[PDB]
Design a protein around this ligand. Sequence first.
Ligand code: PT
Ligand code: PT
Lengths: 160, 158
Amino acid sequence: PRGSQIAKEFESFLLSHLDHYLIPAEDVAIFVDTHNADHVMLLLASNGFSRVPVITKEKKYVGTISISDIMAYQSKGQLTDWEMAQTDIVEMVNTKIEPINEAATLTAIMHKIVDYPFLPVISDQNDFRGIITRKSILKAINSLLHDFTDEYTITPKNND
Amino acid sequence: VPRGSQIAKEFESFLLSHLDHYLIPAEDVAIFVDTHNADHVMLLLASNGFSRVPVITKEKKYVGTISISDIMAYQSKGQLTDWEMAQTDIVEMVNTKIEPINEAATLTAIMHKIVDYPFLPVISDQNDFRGIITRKSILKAINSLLHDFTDEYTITPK
Ligand SMILES: [Pt+2]
Ligand SMILES: [Pt+2]
């Protein structure tokens, strides 16, 4: 059979704080597929971002990029610094984090946010809608842990 | 004890009794020593997939954290040459912004602090490094809470 779902009461409460875990595309730092390998490497080391979403000039999701992705590509094809200043990031884009849909179940988001630091949210047409981070989920989880008892009563159950 | 807004005692009880393994021990956490040369640390951080790593002393005592952005910022601050950077240990570029939590910290405080930082170094009263609590390990426990809380508890509308 299929696995367990999160309690309907928890899913109901968290869906009243949707604004918290979904971070819109306009508030998320991104790189374009046509951007320079060396330039985004210098930028990733200055900003100190583990990995950043890569999108196209028409705002469509491509993958993610990190310093370790660029550095692995440099070793793989023995590319010099001058050659890296002429290479776009399309060729070294990480596609391991499978993007979730806008209509994803909160039970799936909770399972996937454990595995990845962030989940890119896309439309059925692959338009980058934004990201869901471990931090934004924990903000909503924190409100749940403090305010769940405002609309709900929890009583212990004895199974013995 | 005049405590403020606390997490529900039922949630705190469940998280403490079933999945208290969110306190990743010091033996399972990758670390750097404060004497490790900056360039080799930078090369290691760029080879492995790590945003920032805890820095402990030779005597397993907490010092701070290190990231590529910490080393690179120190390099431009003093426009240091690559041979000057080779001799340099990471203890001069260490990041002490993440204030370590105590072993005796409340779960309510851990939950407020894990939102702010990707991980919380857990230390003793003598600053002995005990391990870390990550956003990932907290989310594993939170996931078990969201699925199995109703095993020992009944939730009814108020
Ligand atoms: Pt690099
Ligand atoms: Pt560097």
